[PDB]
Write a protein that binds this DNA or RNA. Structure first.
Ligand code: NA
Length: 348
DNA sequence: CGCTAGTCGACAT
DNA sequence: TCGACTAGCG
């Protein structure tokens, strides 16, 4: 995600405990729990051997949140966004290597170094995620599989008032316009919360605490959607936005060499890349739990054209979207693997 | 100072 | 995966 964002705005953070959300609703990026739980049993998962330690690992977190009187909404990743469809695969292959290498590193005796090999080959499948989903439903905990990336979905759940805070390890949530993000939370409840409103507590941030400018900064610094121009980090991007008296971001990016007083040349496809990135942060498709409909993260502004935003996710039928969201329909094969019905007993 | 890429540890015995 | 941390260079 946004490389080095947390340290950049550490002044806006605060050590908290989950009890401050007792009697309120919190959405969870379940992937972090799934991964941290999968580390404990990477060996069995790599060899294909049966294991389910990650289920219990997630469930102790769930039971903790429930013990402190909090209503958790588990959120999962869905279809891979086209913008990263290569990237993920570019990661995928590497995992395979760390499998083929890893096992061979066990043939040389080095099990200590094979640890890092098998732990860097972990692939969180939809099956494992669904096992966790069943394990959560058995405890009466609502779940929700995002149409695509879970970040946008969580951001929506928080900006809609459905949840008050979001538990995750990804800082990208901030660039999506999240209000309250709880980072680094152990199995006991000790966490680190960052609020959007308190982004002004960061001196080096300047006046770049507004959501739009902050987003521009995050994108310009380098993200999953668009690699940053070489030599551009959070600081110099922030400086560009501070020295800019211009609302139109395109002309500003074209004048980056003027704002940084450097010889920076901007490729004309990088402009389009920035536009696509911004449109992805703004209008990535998410699922509305209440209205049961595929909607963009934010309402389409008048200046944008929804017909040209396929890279931000494609629309499907709202019923199918519902079946995906409930985790009944497989992300890949589009086949029914379950039949949960919330009616016959999040979705008001 | 600031940015890149690269290593490194996570879990837990 | 994803942040943390650092050497190396503009
Ligand atoms: Na960068």
């Amino acid at each position: 995600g946004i490389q080095g964002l947390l340290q950049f705005i550490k002044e806006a953070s605060e050590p908290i405990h989950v009890r401050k959300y007792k009697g309120q609703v919190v959405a969870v990026d379940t992937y972090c729990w799934l991964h941290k739980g999968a580390i404990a049993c990477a060996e069995k998962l790599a060899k294909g051997e049966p294991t389910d330690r990650y289920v219990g690992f997630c469930m102790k977190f769930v039971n903790m949140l429930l013990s402190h009187g909090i209503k958790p909404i588990l959120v999962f990743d869905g279809c891979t966004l086209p913008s990263k469809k290569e990237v993920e695969r570019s990661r995928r292959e590497r995992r395979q290597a760390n499998l083929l290498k890893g096992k061979q590193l066990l043939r040389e005796g080095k099990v200590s170094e094979a640890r890092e090999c098998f732990t860097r080959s972990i692939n969180i499948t939809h099956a494992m995620a669904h096992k966790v989903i069943k394990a959560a439903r058995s405890q009466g905990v609502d779940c929700l599989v995002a149409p695509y990336e879970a970040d946008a979905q969580l951001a929506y759940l928080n900006k809609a008032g459905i949840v008050q805070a979001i538990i995750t390890e990804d800082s990208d949530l901030l660039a999506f316009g999240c209000k309250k993000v709880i980072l680094k939370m152990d199995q006991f409840g000790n966490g680190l919360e960052i609020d959007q409103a308190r982004l002004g507590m960061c001196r080096q941030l300047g006046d770049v605490f507004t959501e739009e400018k902050f987003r521009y900064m995050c994108i310009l610094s380098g993200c999953d959607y668009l690699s940053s121009l070489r030599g551009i980090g959070l600081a110099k991007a922030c400086k560009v936005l501070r020295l800019a008296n211009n609302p139109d971001i395109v002309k500003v990016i074209k004048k980056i060499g003027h704002y940084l007083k450097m010889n920076i040349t901007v490729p004309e496809d990088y402009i389009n890349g920035f536009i696509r990135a911004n449109n992805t942060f703004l209008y990535q498709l998410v699922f509305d739990p209440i209205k049961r409909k595929l909607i963009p993260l934010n309402a389409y502004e008048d200046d944008v054209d929804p017909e040209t935003l396929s890279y931000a996710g494609q629309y499907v039928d709202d019923s199918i979207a519902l079946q995906i969201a409930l985790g009944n329909k497989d992300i890949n094969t589009f086949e029914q693997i379950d039949d949960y019905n919330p009616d016959t007993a999040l979705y008001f």
